[PDB]
Ligand binder design. Structure first.
Ligand SMILES: [Hg+2]
Lengths: 103, 102
């Protein structure tokens, strides 16, 4: 019985992880999108920001570019890892059920 | 005669020059129109800071800037519609000058 209890609790723990990961994947995609369109605009700068109009030097443009591309890649590496993790948790869930149904 | 002919050739050329400048305006204009649409798209994303350079972008400045860009966008589209119609007309006149020339 306590075995069943532990399985049921482990199952809710997995679903919580899977639901949080699902939410993280969505946010990361939004972030990745924002980074790309930001990098796009930034490349059009030539002394002034094309979005807000304020002064933006080639030096800063460049640095802002390096920073955003580093943020973009890291977010894509995390996205990929999140996807794999979600797929793994789904197999665990199917398996945790397997054990339950039996008991 | 020979002077009528000259006048016809000289007018033909002034029309091609007009037609060629409008063509160039249209190209620039279109690119300015795409730039305003992309600047507005990014600007709609601001919430305290400019999403592009990270500077402070207050909600008040965002709306004002959004007003200016929308205003320049619609106008640019106004001029563009006009230039295209003018160019279409100049080409009508060019075809008409050639006839007169035969
Ligand atoms: Hg900016």
């Amino acid at each position: 019985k306590k075995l069943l209890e532990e399985l049921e609790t482990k199952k809710t723990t997995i679903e919580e992880e899977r639901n949080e990961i699902t939410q993280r994947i969505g946010e990361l995609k939004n972030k990745i999108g924002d980074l790309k369109t930001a990098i796009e605009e930034l490349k059009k700068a030539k002394g002034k920001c094309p979005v807000c109009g304020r002064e933006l030097t080639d030096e800063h443009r460049e640095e802002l570019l390096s920073k955003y591309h580093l943020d973009l890649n890291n977010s894509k590496n995390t996205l990929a890892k999140l996807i794999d993790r979600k797929s793994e948790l789904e197999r665990e869930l199917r398996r945790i059920d397997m054990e339950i149904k039996r008991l």
